[PDB]
Amino acid sequence: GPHSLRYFVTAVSRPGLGEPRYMEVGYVDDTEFVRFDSDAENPRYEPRARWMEQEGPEYWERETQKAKGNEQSFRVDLRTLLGYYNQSKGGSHTIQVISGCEVGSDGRLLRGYQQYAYDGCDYIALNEDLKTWTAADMAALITKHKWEQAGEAERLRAYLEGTCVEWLRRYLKNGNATLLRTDSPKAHVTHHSRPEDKVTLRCWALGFYPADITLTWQLNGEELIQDMELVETRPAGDGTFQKWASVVVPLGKEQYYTCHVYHQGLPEPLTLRWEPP
């Protein structure tokens, strides 16, 4: 299937408390694999997946400086945006960037990402055509004009079509067995009281990877939408994820309800009911 190499960039100013904090966070297909964090006297690019440790002293040296470079670029950038928006010197502000490529299994570029945001709001982004910009306001129009007259789109296009694609291939050969790992969910149902003649059945899914999963409750046939309650999938904090969905059933009727667990690591969906010992 397709794959993606993406970089998540953060620059956070903090007047009279120190230099802005900068981070570059690397992702191959939603797995973080590299991180750089400017909070250190001698900050360094770090591996965040074991398979990245295969890269030599030179790779880290090279990336570290590049990020350091980038950081300084964003320090100016924060100062510049105050100038564009006419904001006072003492506010903390945030620049965020999403940068990278998505490549098909043929090795062609499906789409490219360069999305800028200022204080959690879209600032500028590269269009699907990989040649022009969409600016979200008068301020970004100044950044559009500057990138038009330095042909930034072209330099970016080159990175997307070249460096990005090429390295994503290098990375994939190093960590492919790892990224492909798949942990099926384990499901149980719990039982809980409720005022009077109602009970809560809760369908749990635990110890699964990746995070995509679907939990549904069925009654005698059709599914339970309107009344069902569920929570956002959440990390167990050991690399796995967890989720549950629950439904309020008549006391004595528990056995009439079926929970279905749908996940990619499963030979087939899991079906379970409440089991009173």
Binding site: E24, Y116, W147, C164
Partner: peptide
């Protein structure tokens, strides 16, 4: 490898 970003 991360892009070498341009100033905005």
């Amino acid at each position: 490898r991360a892009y070498i970003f341009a100033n905005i």
